[PDB]
Amino acid sequence: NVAHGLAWSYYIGYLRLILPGLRARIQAYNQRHGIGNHRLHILFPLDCGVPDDLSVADPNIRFLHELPQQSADRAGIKGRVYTNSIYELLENGQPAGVCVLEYATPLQTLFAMSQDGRAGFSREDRLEQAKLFCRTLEDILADAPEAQNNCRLIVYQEPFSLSQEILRHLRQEER
């Protein structure tokens, strides 16, 4: 039952660490190089298919630029680096949305566990933990309104246009 650990790890060791300073980094980027939405948009594919490059697997998702990095001495690691990536969403091939976008890496852990031969993780076990991971994280954010307001949770299950799914969320947020 790894979902409970993955969710608290994801929240303690990343979300509540990176979300406070995200708006200022987004503002800094708009000063030099716009990005209307100032939330981290996290993708939650329950199939746990997490490619390393987002834009390489979709013509309507295009990498734009890195945000200004955020460095910190972390647990004996001097200058641990946290980078987030700006992507533009394309509709008929002409910018439709721009936002800081990434996957929820804990799902990548669930997938690799399902592929590990030295483990008893089945694709049914993974989908069970994938839902339980999302629910646990959502329960944490429900009592953390600042972090909850500083990110967007995009939960879906591919049987589809990911760029359309993302743009649907961006248009809902504009209200």
Add this chain to the structure above:
Amino acid sequence: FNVAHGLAWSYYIGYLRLILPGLRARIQAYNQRHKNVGIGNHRLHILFPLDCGVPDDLSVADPNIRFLHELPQQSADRAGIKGRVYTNSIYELLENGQPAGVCVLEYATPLQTLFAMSQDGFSREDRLEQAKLFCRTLEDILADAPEAQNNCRLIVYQEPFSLSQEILRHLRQEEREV
């Protein structure tokens, strides 16, 4: 409400399995660019305080752990994040003020997650209970992983003692092992 199994598989799949294959190449890159004693221990040494006291700067834990230099930083695309950076730090361990050992050294960062969970029904004895379960679950994973069990060393201790002397014992054991 058990988190140790999640922390263990997260630490292995999301870090060790990714960072350990190329650690030796990074270390030999360092040895060719700097003079030492050089780094003859190619294992990542991971401090595992069961009390979950994880300061960010190792010199707070013991001034006889002195930061030397960073390893070559690595860049990779992962989980939709472009150029996620992987960086590790080299420390020298002092004996009578003089360098007696050099290695790549850090804390097991997920132990901070266990600590923050104890601040805010998660007591410190549940925290200590989860840390031990974190340790032994990870050791079972390393037990079935020949490559990673050879490229890293967990240093497991409970603080009631010289942490620098604890590390030097592992390094001396590793160097004198048949």
